[PDB]
Amino acid sequence: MEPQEERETQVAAWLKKIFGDHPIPQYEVNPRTTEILHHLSERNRVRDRDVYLVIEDLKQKASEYESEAKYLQDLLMESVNFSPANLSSTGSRYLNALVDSAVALETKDTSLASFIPAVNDLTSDLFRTKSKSEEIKIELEKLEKNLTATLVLEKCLQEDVKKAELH
Amino acid sequence: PRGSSFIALSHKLGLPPGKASELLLPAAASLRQDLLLLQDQRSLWCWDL
Amino acid sequence: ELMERDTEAQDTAMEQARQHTQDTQRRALLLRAQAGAMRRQQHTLRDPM
Amino acid sequence: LEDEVQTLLKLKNLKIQRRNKCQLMASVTSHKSLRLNAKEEEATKKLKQS
Amino acid sequence: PPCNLSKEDLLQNPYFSKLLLNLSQHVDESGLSLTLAKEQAQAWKEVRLHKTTWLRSEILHRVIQELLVDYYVKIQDTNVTSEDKKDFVWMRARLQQEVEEQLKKKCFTLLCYYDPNSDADSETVKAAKVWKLAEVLVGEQQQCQDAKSQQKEQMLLLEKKSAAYSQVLLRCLTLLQRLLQEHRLKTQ
Amino acid sequence: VLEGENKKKELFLTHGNLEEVAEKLKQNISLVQDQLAVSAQEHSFFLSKR
């Protein structure tokens, strides 16, 4: 259980971390203001560490993909002497069509047997995501009529309070 | 077998099979970003409750 | 979903079968490459022999 | 209610029109898997006889 | 006790509200630092810049493997591609055009299954739809993700209107108990 | 990222362990959204009572 002194100490340490060159306005010294920002800072450090991990993972995987692309290219020339420039215009166009189709599918295996479940799932989830959202908008009218009837009842009952006071 | 482990991790993280294995970490953290996008709403359904 | 499971039972193993075929045929053709290379060694030694 | 019925009916119509497609896809996947299994045997015989 | 932030808690400490307003330019809806989001975007830019070449190189060798295994199947037929084991430049000259042929095979075969309207299409419109399939699937993915990204704000909307209904019902309960007890039960 | 700030790095990390951690995250998300739904239903029941 971090006390309010340690709470405000971590808040003061976090102020210069967040603002830096930005000016730091003064807060009212009460446990509420000190308490609320503590959880925000605690989860902000967690998510920033996680995003550090994601950024370093992306740079690492980009370097790995460069290394694997170079290795597979060298394997291509040492095996069948194949380069992307050897194919004709229609061959390069088909290659680029498969490249940006796989980009749209964000998949790794270019086999047709890997295309078919991904293509079927991409066809299906597009309508699945818009499915089941109709329940919200058909349940909305009951809450809307209840709130509207009770609101006009509220103003009617306020006028009833006034008229009952008159009576 | 590590490939089967990674596809199983994609299965348990909601990623479709055969997808980009390198987007596992951005998605799962986003799931954690979704996770923190839930429990606070739980408090919004609890304390006012 | 049942016959999707039936198809995925082969979808998982088709890449493994292709990898097994490629690796086994490469380690099989290196036997013939070895045979040629130390046939060359044989005839490199045999005429002086 | 009739609109709901016909939307489910056309949903199942497209489900059958992909059901036969899925039969075709299992067929071509099974043929390609058996193709790879038949590609294994050249590797085995080149590992044995050579 | 309103442990969560409320309007009463907002008006209790306006300085705290102005302090939290400065975090908006730093902490977004997801919570991330905006410069950390920009660094994530730049790392993803490196990822896509390298993966363009990676996907350019991967499908070439995959289609070479597919052509070689199709010629394996053709060895079992009458016309044997045995000269692939014999010649290298001849198999290269055949290999370029037949990698193109297998790319055509894969593209038109997949488009025969992707759309029933594209099942019996001619080769020119099939090729055009092969070129445009990337944009079609990007649009499909975007429209798929739009509803899932959308649903959160209607969930919050129904939740807050549900709480507003509770506030209105509490006010009505107070007014009705005033009308019954104070105006009718005791005084009257 | 998946285990987070709750615990540090383990002495022996296996892919089955990370599979279990991913299942833990998915189960946490599912239980939290189920609690969200049941809390909304409970507050709506008290709304109907009011």
Curated annotation (Swiss-Prot), chain A:
Keywords: Cell cycle, Cell division, Coiled coil, Cytoplasm, Cytoskeleton, Microtubule, Mitosis. It comes from the Eukaryota. Residues 49-79, 124-167 form a coiled coil. The keyword Cell division applies. It is found in: Cytoplasm; Cytoplasm, Cytoskeleton, Microtubule organizing center, Centrosome; Cytoplasm, Cytoskeleton, Spindle; Cytoplasm, Cytoskeleton, Spindle pole. GO terms for cellular component: centrosome; cytosol; HAUS complex; mitotic spindle microtubule; spindle pole. Widely expressed. Expressed in pancreas, kidney, skeletal muscle, liver and heart. Weakly expressed in lung, brain and placenta. One of its GO terms (biological process) is cell division. Signal peptide: none annotated. Component of the HAUS augmin-like complex. The complex interacts with the gamma-tubulin ring complex and this interaction is required for spindle assembly. Associates with microtubules. The interaction with microtubules is strong during mitosis, while it is weak or absent during interphase. It is unclear whether this interaction is direct or indirect. Interacts with EML3 (phosphorylated at 'Thr-881'). Belongs to the HAUS1 family. HAUS1-depleted cells retain functional cell cycle checkpoints, but the depletion decreases the G2/M cell cycle compartment and induces apoptosis. The protein level remains constant through the cell cycle. This is HAUS augmin-like complex subunit 1. It comes from Homo sapiens (Human). The gene is HAUS1. The chain holds residues 1 to 167 of 278 of the full protein.
From Swiss-Prot, chain C:
It is found in: Cytoplasm, Cytoskeleton, Microtubule organizing center, Centrosome; Cytoplasm, Cytoskeleton, Spindle. Contributes to mitotic spindle assembly, maintenance of centrosome integrity and completion of cytokinesis as part of the HAUS augmin-like complex. Belongs to the HAUS5 family. Component of the HAUS augmin-like complex. The complex interacts with the gamma-tubulin ring complex and this interaction is required for spindle assembly. Interacts with EML3 (phosphorylated at 'Thr-881'). This is HAUS augmin-like complex subunit 5. The gene is HAUS5. The chain holds residues 99 to 147 of 633 of the full protein.
UniProtKB/Swiss-Prot annotation, chain D:
It is found in: Cytoplasm, Cytoskeleton, Microtubule organizing center, Centrosome; Cytoplasm, Cytoskeleton, Spindle. Component of the HAUS augmin-like complex. The complex interacts with the gamma-tubulin ring complex and this interaction is required for spindle assembly. Interacts with EML3 (phosphorylated at 'Thr-881'). Contributes to mitotic spindle assembly, maintenance of centrosome integrity and completion of cytokinesis as part of the HAUS augmin-like complex. Belongs to the HAUS3 family. This is HAUS augmin-like complex subunit 3. It comes from Homo sapiens (Human). The gene is HAUS3. The chain holds residues 102 to 151 of 603 of the full protein.
From Swiss-Prot, chain E:
GO terms for biological process: cell division; centrosome cycle; regulation of microtubule nucleation; spindle assembly. The keyword Cell cycle applies. Coiled coil: none annotated. GO terms for cellular component: centrosome; cytosol; HAUS complex; mitotic spindle microtubule. Keywords: Cell cycle, Cell division, Cytoplasm, Cytoskeleton, Microtubule, Mitosis. The keyword Acyltransferase does not apply. It comes from the Eukaryota. One of its GO terms (molecular function) is microtubule minus-end binding. It is found in: Cytoplasm, Cytoskeleton, Microtubule organizing center, Centrosome; Cytoplasm, Cytoskeleton, Spindle. Component of the HAUS augmin-like complex. The complex interacts with the gamma-tubulin ring complex and this interaction is required for spindle assembly. Interacts with EML3 (phosphorylated at 'Thr-881'). Belongs to the HAUS4 family. Contributes to mitotic spindle assembly, maintenance of centrosome integrity and completion of cytokinesis as part of the HAUS augmin-like complex. This is HAUS augmin-like complex subunit 4. It comes from Homo sapiens (Human). The gene is HAUS4. The chain holds residues 25 to 257 of 363 of the full protein.
